[PDB]
């Protein structure tokens, strides 16, 4: 099955673009973020641990998040001809462990947005949906964390040869025209 990594900063537009991809190509959208939040909503002690980490805007340990990705992948396994892995990997070791335990990605969609643009979007979603990590201080924390840990992931897969960059400063469906182009050329 096709495994696509979709990687980019906070509020760059990963989720948005992934759901457009689902609607058009019928890939299976797996959000590490959605998976983690669902474990939070479960009421477990683990959820309490994950909620604390996410509220501070830090990386959840590789073991937890890779576990959930693999689980979800295995569940949707008999209906998926493709997978969109949204927001994983976020550090080089995550990409390495994914490859050891699951498989190699066909493509990495690099959803590229300016830092200020990302702050603007998250600041807006913060005032509307009231996601706990969208407060101003946590945003700065998520943004710095993206620059330090997740950018080398982009380098890693550029060395692999599979990164395609899309300009996420554009209007949403102009962005998606780029995503479509990258996916069509598989
Ligand atoms: N692998 C991992 N390892 C360790 N920890 C992990 C982990 N994965 C998750 N975690 C933990 O989970 C937490 C949250 O991670 P996660 O849930 O993955 O989210 P995020 O990366 O912090 O960012 P968002 O999902 O909020 O934004 P987005 O890039 O998907 O864009 P979106 O379309 O949704 O929304 C963007 C906003 O802008 C709008 N928008 C989108 N595109 C455009 C456009 N072209 N023009 C105008 N507006 C746009 C959107 O409507 C929206 O309002 C992490 O902080 C971490 O603590």
PDB file of C-alpha atoms and ligand atoms in Angstrom:
ATOM      1  CA  UNK A   1       0.000   0.000   0.000  1.00  0.00           C
ATOM      2  CA  UNK A   2       0.983   3.611  -0.684  1.00  0.00           C
ATOM      3  CA  UNK A   3       2.313   5.364   2.393  1.00  0.00           C
ATOM      4  CA  UNK A   4       2.488   9.111   2.186  1.00  0.00           C
ATOM      5  CA  UNK A   5       4.066  11.253   4.865  1.00  0.00           C
ATOM      6  CA  UNK A   6       2.534  14.698   5.207  1.00  0.00           C
ATOM      7  CA  UNK A   7       4.852  16.921   7.157  1.00  0.00           C
ATOM      8  CA  UNK A   8       4.844  20.629   7.926  1.00  0.00           C
ATOM      9  CA  UNK A   9       4.694  23.161  10.708  1.00  0.00           C
ATOM     10  CA  UNK A  10       1.773  23.817  13.075  1.00  0.00           C
ATOM     11  CA  UNK A  11      -1.199  25.222  11.192  1.00  0.00           C
ATOM     12  CA  UNK A  12       0.604  24.904   7.860  1.00  0.00           C
ATOM     13  CA  UNK A  13      -2.410  23.151   6.374  1.00  0.00           C
ATOM     14  CA  UNK A  14      -1.668  19.411   6.640  1.00  0.00           C
ATOM     15  CA  UNK A  15      -5.136  18.481   7.928  1.00  0.00           C
ATOM     16  CA  UNK A  16      -6.983  20.624   5.423  1.00  0.00           C
ATOM     17  CA  UNK A  17      -5.047  19.232   2.466  1.00  0.00           C
ATOM     18  CA  UNK A  18      -5.287  15.655   3.719  1.00  0.00           C
ATOM     19  CA  UNK A  19      -9.065  15.788   3.846  1.00  0.00           C
ATOM     20  CA  UNK A  20      -9.148  17.111   0.279  1.00  0.00           C
ATOM     21  CA  UNK A  21      -6.903  14.182  -0.687  1.00  0.00           C
ATOM     22  CA  UNK A  22      -9.292  11.737   0.976  1.00  0.00           C
ATOM     23  CA  UNK A  23     -12.283  13.219  -0.848  1.00  0.00           C
ATOM     24  CA  UNK A  24     -10.637  12.903  -4.261  1.00  0.00           C
ATOM     25  CA  UNK A  25      -8.361   9.867  -4.050  1.00  0.00           C
ATOM     26  CA  UNK A  26      -9.927   7.914  -1.207  1.00  0.00           C
ATOM     27  CA  UNK A  27      -6.699   7.449   0.726  1.00  0.00           C
ATOM     28  CA  UNK A  28      -6.940   6.784   4.460  1.00  0.00           C
ATOM     29  CA  UNK A  29      -6.183   9.870   6.584  1.00  0.00           C
ATOM     30  CA  UNK A  30      -4.382   9.048   9.836  1.00  0.00           C
ATOM     31  CA  UNK A  31      -3.684  11.975  12.122  1.00  0.00           C
ATOM     32  CA  UNK A  32      -1.207  11.306  14.893  1.00  0.00           C
ATOM     33  CA  UNK A  33      -2.778  14.369  16.526  1.00  0.00           C
ATOM     34  CA  UNK A  34      -6.301  12.966  16.185  1.00  0.00           C
ATOM     35  CA  UNK A  35      -5.177   9.614  17.526  1.00  0.00           C
ATOM     36  CA  UNK A  36      -3.542  11.227  20.566  1.00  0.00           C
ATOM     37  CA  UNK A  37      -6.525  13.490  21.330  1.00  0.00           C
ATOM     38  CA  UNK A  38      -8.796  10.439  21.130  1.00  0.00           C
ATOM     39  CA  UNK A  39      -6.718   8.726  23.778  1.00  0.00           C
ATOM     40  CA  UNK A  40      -7.043  11.899  25.852  1.00  0.00           C
ATOM     41  CA  UNK A  41     -10.824  11.817  25.495  1.00  0.00           C
ATOM     42  CA  UNK A  42     -10.858   8.177  26.570  1.00  0.00           C
ATOM     43  CA  UNK A  43     -10.321   9.210  30.188  1.00  0.00           C
ATOM     44  CA  UNK A  44      -7.261   6.972  30.682  1.00  0.00           C
ATOM     45  CA  UNK A  45      -4.195   7.821  32.755  1.00  0.00           C
ATOM     46  CA  UNK A  46      -2.247   7.733  29.522  1.00  0.00           C
ATOM     47  CA  UNK A  47      -4.579  10.376  28.127  1.00  0.00           C
ATOM     48  CA  UNK A  48      -3.847  12.528  31.157  1.00  0.00           C
ATOM     49  CA  UNK A  49      -0.159  12.150  30.420  1.00  0.00           C
ATOM     50  CA  UNK A  50      -0.592  12.945  26.721  1.00  0.00           C
ATOM     51  CA  UNK A  51      -2.848  15.961  27.440  1.00  0.00           C
ATOM     52  CA  UNK A  52      -0.174  17.437  29.730  1.00  0.00           C
ATOM     53  CA  UNK A  53       2.493  17.071  27.062  1.00  0.00           C
ATOM     54  CA  UNK A  54       0.359  18.409  24.247  1.00  0.00           C
ATOM     55  CA  UNK A  55      -0.851  21.387  26.305  1.00  0.00           C
ATOM     56  CA  UNK A  56       2.791  22.361  26.874  1.00  0.00           C
ATOM     57  CA  UNK A  57       3.340  21.893  23.104  1.00  0.00           C
ATOM     58  CA  UNK A  58       6.024  19.212  23.337  1.00  0.00           C
ATOM     59  CA  UNK A  59       6.667  15.987  21.476  1.00  0.00           C
ATOM     60  CA  UNK A  60       4.901  12.886  22.663  1.00  0.00           C
ATOM     61  CA  UNK A  61       7.325   9.947  22.953  1.00  0.00           C
ATOM     62  CA  UNK A  62       7.971   7.945  19.783  1.00  0.00           C
ATOM     63  CA  UNK A  63       6.697   4.724  21.394  1.00  0.00           C
ATOM     64  CA  UNK A  64       3.214   5.988  22.149  1.00  0.00           C
ATOM     65  CA  UNK A  65       2.582   7.763  18.845  1.00  0.00           C
ATOM     66  CA  UNK A  66       4.122   5.090  16.603  1.00  0.00           C
ATOM     67  CA  UNK A  67       2.089   2.476  18.464  1.00  0.00           C
ATOM     68  CA  UNK A  68      -1.107   4.318  17.683  1.00  0.00           C
ATOM     69  CA  UNK A  69      -0.211   4.955  14.045  1.00  0.00           C
ATOM     70  CA  UNK A  70       0.585   1.280  13.456  1.00  0.00           C
ATOM     71  CA  UNK A  71      -2.603   0.180  15.296  1.00  0.00           C
ATOM     72  CA  UNK A  72      -4.795   2.532  13.231  1.00  0.00           C
ATOM     73  CA  UNK A  73      -3.018   1.430  10.017  1.00  0.00           C
ATOM     74  CA  UNK A  74      -3.686  -2.196  10.881  1.00  0.00           C
ATOM     75  CA  UNK A  75      -7.374  -1.497  11.646  1.00  0.00           C
ATOM     76  CA  UNK A  76      -8.069   0.324   8.371  1.00  0.00           C
ATOM     77  CA  UNK A  77      -5.921  -2.244   6.568  1.00  0.00           C
ATOM     78  CA  UNK A  78      -8.670  -4.010   4.634  1.00  0.00           C
ATOM     79  CA  UNK A  79     -10.185  -0.809   3.209  1.00  0.00           C
ATOM     80  CA  UNK A  80      -7.021   1.154   2.391  1.00  0.00           C
ATOM     81  CA  UNK A  81      -5.216   1.229  -0.911  1.00  0.00           C
ATOM     82  CA  UNK A  82      -3.251   4.188   0.450  1.00  0.00           C
ATOM     83  CA  UNK A  83      -2.324   5.955   3.695  1.00  0.00           C
ATOM     84  CA  UNK A  84      -1.870   9.642   4.481  1.00  0.00           C
ATOM     85  CA  UNK A  85       0.269   9.830   7.597  1.00  0.00           C
ATOM     86  CA  UNK A  86      -0.502  13.282   8.890  1.00  0.00           C
ATOM     87  CA  UNK A  87       1.962  14.872  11.308  1.00  0.00           C
ATOM     88  CA  UNK A  88       4.243  11.864  11.549  1.00  0.00           C
ATOM     89  CA  UNK A  89       7.205  11.792  11.544  1.00  0.00           C
ATOM     90  CA  UNK A  90       8.314  14.849  13.521  1.00  0.00           C
ATOM     91  CA  UNK A  91      11.844  13.795  14.241  1.00  0.00           C
ATOM     92  CA  UNK A  92      14.328  11.694  12.295  1.00  0.00           C
ATOM     93  CA  UNK A  93      14.147   8.736  14.707  1.00  0.00           C
ATOM     94  CA  UNK A  94      10.373   8.549  14.140  1.00  0.00           C
ATOM     95  CA  UNK A  95      10.921   8.130  10.418  1.00  0.00           C
ATOM     96  CA  UNK A  96      13.557   5.525  11.081  1.00  0.00           C
ATOM     97  CA  UNK A  97      11.404   3.545  13.541  1.00  0.00           C
ATOM     98  CA  UNK A  98       8.395   3.719  11.245  1.00  0.00           C
ATOM     99  CA  UNK A  99      10.508   2.210   8.486  1.00  0.00           C
ATOM    100  CA  UNK A 100      11.761  -0.576  10.795  1.00  0.00           C
ATOM    101  CA  UNK A 101       8.326  -1.504  12.162  1.00  0.00           C
ATOM    102  CA  UNK A 102       5.982  -0.763   9.278  1.00  0.00           C
ATOM    103  CA  UNK A 103       7.397   0.242   5.896  1.00  0.00           C
ATOM    104  CA  UNK A 104       9.010   2.882   3.673  1.00  0.00           C
ATOM    105  CA  UNK A 105       7.054   5.945   2.468  1.00  0.00           C
ATOM    106  CA  UNK A 106       6.420   6.455  -1.254  1.00  0.00           C
ATOM    107  CA  UNK A 107       6.385  10.231  -0.907  1.00  0.00           C
ATOM    108  CA  UNK A 108       6.656  13.040   1.621  1.00  0.00           C
ATOM    109  CA  UNK A 109       4.384  16.022   1.078  1.00  0.00           C
ATOM    110  CA  UNK A 110       6.133  18.976   2.599  1.00  0.00           C
ATOM    111  CA  UNK A 111       3.433  21.514   3.462  1.00  0.00           C
ATOM    112  CA  UNK A 112       5.452  24.717   3.541  1.00  0.00           C
ATOM    113  CA  UNK A 113       4.239  27.860   5.260  1.00  0.00           C
ATOM    114  CA  UNK A 114       5.894  30.948   6.667  1.00  0.00           C
ATOM    115  CA  UNK A 115       6.210  31.076  10.462  1.00  0.00           C
ATOM    116  CA  UNK A 116       4.131  34.235  10.784  1.00  0.00           C
ATOM    117  CA  UNK A 117       1.394  32.756   8.623  1.00  0.00           C
ATOM    118  CA  UNK A 118       1.297  29.696  10.896  1.00  0.00           C
ATOM    119  CA  UNK A 119       1.010  31.861  14.017  1.00  0.00           C
ATOM    120  CA  UNK A 120      -1.815  33.810  12.371  1.00  0.00           C
ATOM    121  CA  UNK A 121      -3.787  30.652  11.503  1.00  0.00           C
ATOM    122  CA  UNK A 122      -3.352  29.061  14.918  1.00  0.00           C
ATOM    123  CA  UNK A 123      -4.173  32.375  16.621  1.00  0.00           C
ATOM    124  CA  UNK A 124      -7.467  32.352  14.698  1.00  0.00           C
ATOM    125  CA  UNK A 125      -8.346  28.722  15.350  1.00  0.00           C
ATOM    126  CA  UNK A 126      -7.506  29.416  18.986  1.00  0.00           C
ATOM    127  CA  UNK A 127     -10.172  32.115  19.242  1.00  0.00           C
ATOM    128  CA  UNK A 128     -12.757  29.896  17.508  1.00  0.00           C
ATOM    129  CA  UNK A 129     -12.365  26.190  18.319  1.00  0.00           C
ATOM    130  CA  UNK A 130     -10.578  26.790  21.619  1.00  0.00           C
ATOM    131  CA  UNK A 131      -8.059  23.953  21.226  1.00  0.00           C
ATOM    132  CA  UNK A 132      -5.974  23.885  24.425  1.00  0.00           C
ATOM    133  CA  UNK A 133      -2.588  24.141  22.645  1.00  0.00           C
ATOM    134  CA  UNK A 134      -3.660  27.089  20.494  1.00  0.00           C
ATOM    135  CA  UNK A 135      -2.984  29.629  23.253  1.00  0.00           C
ATOM    136  CA  UNK A 136      -0.288  32.107  22.311  1.00  0.00           C
ATOM    137  CA  UNK A 137       2.595  30.777  24.424  1.00  0.00           C
ATOM    138  CA  UNK A 138       2.115  27.143  23.438  1.00  0.00           C
ATOM    139  CA  UNK A 139       2.035  28.199  19.791  1.00  0.00           C
ATOM    140  CA  UNK A 140       5.495  29.745  20.079  1.00  0.00           C
ATOM    141  CA  UNK A 141       6.642  26.548  21.749  1.00  0.00           C
ATOM    142  CA  UNK A 142       5.238  24.321  18.954  1.00  0.00           C
ATOM    143  CA  UNK A 143       6.781  26.512  16.301  1.00  0.00           C
ATOM    144  CA  UNK A 144      10.279  26.453  17.806  1.00  0.00           C
ATOM    145  CA  UNK A 145       9.920  22.709  18.288  1.00  0.00           C
ATOM    146  CA  UNK A 146       9.034  22.286  14.635  1.00  0.00           C
ATOM    147  CA  UNK A 147      12.101  24.217  13.499  1.00  0.00           C
ATOM    148  CA  UNK A 148      14.491  22.277  15.726  1.00  0.00           C
ATOM    149  CA  UNK A 149      13.193  18.683  15.481  1.00  0.00           C
ATOM    150  CA  UNK A 150      11.040  18.370  12.386  1.00  0.00           C
ATOM    151  CA  UNK A 151      12.988  20.250   9.720  1.00  0.00           C
ATOM    152  CA  UNK A 152      15.785  17.638   9.742  1.00  0.00           C
ATOM    153  CA  UNK A 153      13.024  15.150   8.869  1.00  0.00           C
ATOM    154  CA  UNK A 154      12.615  17.144   5.657  1.00  0.00           C
ATOM    155  CA  UNK A 155      16.366  16.914   5.019  1.00  0.00           C
ATOM    156  CA  UNK A 156      16.325  13.147   5.692  1.00  0.00           C
ATOM    157  CA  UNK A 157      13.676  12.478   3.070  1.00  0.00           C
ATOM    158  CA  UNK A 158      15.246  14.894   0.638  1.00  0.00           C
ATOM    159  CA  UNK A 159      18.305  12.655   0.900  1.00  0.00           C
ATOM    160  CA  UNK A 160      15.969   9.745   0.294  1.00  0.00           C
ATOM    161  CA  UNK A 161      14.685  11.551  -2.811  1.00  0.00           C
ATOM    162  CA  UNK A 162      10.970  11.671  -2.100  1.00  0.00           C
ATOM    163  CA  UNK A 163      10.139  15.123  -0.774  1.00  0.00           C
ATOM    164  CA  UNK A 164       7.789  17.261  -2.813  1.00  0.00           C
ATOM    165  CA  UNK A 165       7.277  20.766  -1.529  1.00  0.00           C
ATOM    166  CA  UNK A 166       3.954  22.570  -1.774  1.00  0.00           C
ATOM    167  CA  UNK A 167       3.441  26.276  -1.172  1.00  0.00           C
ATOM    168  CA  UNK A 168       0.882  26.463   1.604  1.00  0.00           C
ATOM    169  CA  UNK A 169       0.776  30.283   1.578  1.00  0.00           C
ATOM    170  CA  UNK A 170      -1.608  30.050  -1.351  1.00  0.00           C
ATOM    171  CA  UNK A 171      -5.386  29.735  -1.298  1.00  0.00           C
ATOM    172  CA  UNK A 172      -6.407  26.272  -0.155  1.00  0.00           C
ATOM    173  CA  UNK A 173      -7.448  24.858  -3.518  1.00  0.00           C
ATOM    174  CA  UNK A 174      -4.414  26.384  -5.197  1.00  0.00           C
ATOM    175  CA  UNK A 175      -2.349  24.475  -2.648  1.00  0.00           C
ATOM    176  CA  UNK A 176      -4.334  21.298  -3.421  1.00  0.00           C
ATOM    177  CA  UNK A 177      -3.599  21.666  -7.127  1.00  0.00           C
ATOM    178  CA  UNK A 178       0.033  21.141  -6.134  1.00  0.00           C
ATOM    179  CA  UNK A 179      -0.767  18.225  -3.850  1.00  0.00           C
ATOM    180  CA  UNK A 180      -2.849  16.663  -6.664  1.00  0.00           C
ATOM    181  CA  UNK A 181       0.067  17.080  -9.032  1.00  0.00           C
ATOM    182  CA  UNK A 182       2.490  15.358  -6.644  1.00  0.00           C
ATOM    183  CA  UNK A 183       0.079  12.477  -6.018  1.00  0.00           C
ATOM    184  CA  UNK A 184      -0.760  12.066  -9.731  1.00  0.00           C
ATOM    185  CA  UNK A 185       2.922  11.634 -10.573  1.00  0.00           C
ATOM    186  CA  UNK A 186       3.169   8.507  -8.447  1.00  0.00           C
TER     187      UNK A 186
HETATM  188  N1  LIG B   1       4.482  12.561  15.451  1.00  0.00           N
HETATM  189  C1  LIG B   1       4.242  13.237  16.698  1.00  0.00           C
HETATM  190  N2  LIG B   1       5.280  13.058  17.533  1.00  0.00           N
HETATM  191  C2  LIG B   1       5.258  13.614  18.780  1.00  0.00           C
HETATM  192  N3  LIG B   1       4.182  14.357  19.170  1.00  0.00           N
HETATM  193  C3  LIG B   1       3.135  14.542  18.326  1.00  0.00           C
HETATM  194  C4  LIG B   1       3.157  13.984  17.099  1.00  0.00           C
HETATM  195  N4  LIG B   1       2.017  14.317  16.462  1.00  0.00           N
HETATM  196  C5  LIG B   1       1.289  15.083  17.290  1.00  0.00           C
HETATM  197  N5  LIG B   1       1.973  15.223  18.445  1.00  0.00           N
HETATM  198  C6  LIG B   1       1.430  16.014  19.497  1.00  0.00           C
HETATM  199  O1  LIG B   1      -0.019  16.535  19.016  1.00  0.00           O
HETATM  200  C7  LIG B   1       0.026  17.840  19.058  1.00  0.00           C
HETATM  201  C8  LIG B   1      -0.793  18.471  17.912  1.00  0.00           C
HETATM  202  O2  LIG B   1      -0.215  17.945  16.716  1.00  0.00           O
HETATM  203  P1  LIG B   1      -1.179  17.921  15.408  1.00  0.00           P
HETATM  204  O3  LIG B   1      -2.564  17.470  15.799  1.00  0.00           O
HETATM  205  O4  LIG B   1      -0.573  16.959  14.406  1.00  0.00           O
HETATM  206  O5  LIG B   1      -1.411  19.356  14.857  1.00  0.00           O
HETATM  207  P2  LIG B   1      -0.378  20.489  14.573  1.00  0.00           P
HETATM  208  O6  LIG B   1       0.824  19.981  13.793  1.00  0.00           O
HETATM  209  O7  LIG B   1       0.089  21.156  15.846  1.00  0.00           O
HETATM  210  O8  LIG B   1      -1.062  21.594  13.684  1.00  0.00           O
HETATM  211  P3  LIG B   1      -2.546  21.600  13.209  1.00  0.00           P
HETATM  212  O9  LIG B   1      -3.155  20.222  13.061  1.00  0.00           O
HETATM  213  O10 LIG B   1      -3.341  22.365  14.245  1.00  0.00           O
HETATM  214  O11 LIG B   1      -2.591  22.369  11.837  1.00  0.00           O
HETATM  215  P4  LIG B   1      -2.515  21.805  10.401  1.00  0.00           P
HETATM  216  O12 LIG B   1      -1.095  21.848   9.912  1.00  0.00           O
HETATM  217  O13 LIG B   1      -3.020  20.408  10.268  1.00  0.00           O
HETATM  218  O14 LIG B   1      -3.392  22.753   9.493  1.00  0.00           O
HETATM  219  P5  LIG B   1      -4.979  22.800   9.549  1.00  0.00           P
HETATM  220  O15 LIG B   1      -5.517  22.558   8.172  1.00  0.00           O
HETATM  221  O16 LIG B   1      -5.553  21.764  10.477  1.00  0.00           O
HETATM  222  O17 LIG B   1      -5.407  24.212  10.074  1.00  0.00           O
HETATM  223  C9  LIG B   1      -4.594  25.323   9.765  1.00  0.00           C
HETATM  224  C10 LIG B   1      -5.483  26.581   9.995  1.00  0.00           C
HETATM  225  O18 LIG B   1      -5.318  27.411   9.020  1.00  0.00           O
HETATM  226  C11 LIG B   1      -6.503  27.156   7.930  1.00  0.00           C
HETATM  227  N6  LIG B   1      -5.873  26.933   6.658  1.00  0.00           N
HETATM  228  C12 LIG B   1      -5.315  25.808   6.148  1.00  0.00           C
HETATM  229  N7  LIG B   1      -4.822  26.094   4.921  1.00  0.00           N
HETATM  230  C13 LIG B   1      -5.066  27.403   4.656  1.00  0.00           C
HETATM  231  C14 LIG B   1      -4.774  28.191   3.548  1.00  0.00           C
HETATM  232  N8  LIG B   1      -4.138  27.895   2.366  1.00  0.00           N
HETATM  233  N9  LIG B   1      -5.142  29.485   3.544  1.00  0.00           N
HETATM  234  C15 LIG B   1      -5.790  30.020   4.631  1.00  0.00           C
HETATM  235  N10 LIG B   1      -6.070  29.249   5.723  1.00  0.00           N
HETATM  236  C16 LIG B   1      -5.708  27.932   5.733  1.00  0.00           C
HETATM  237  C17 LIG B   1      -7.138  26.128   8.358  1.00  0.00           C
HETATM  238  O19 LIG B   1      -8.605  26.229   8.118  1.00  0.00           O
HETATM  239  C18 LIG B   1      -6.936  26.151   9.885  1.00  0.00           C
HETATM  240  O20 LIG B   1      -7.752  27.053  10.471  1.00  0.00           O
HETATM  241  C19 LIG B   1       1.472  18.151  18.769  1.00  0.00           C
HETATM  242  O21 LIG B   1       1.713  19.389  19.235  1.00  0.00           O
HETATM  243  C20 LIG B   1       2.176  17.078  19.614  1.00  0.00           C
HETATM  244  O22 LIG B   1       2.233  17.590  21.004  1.00  0.00           O
END
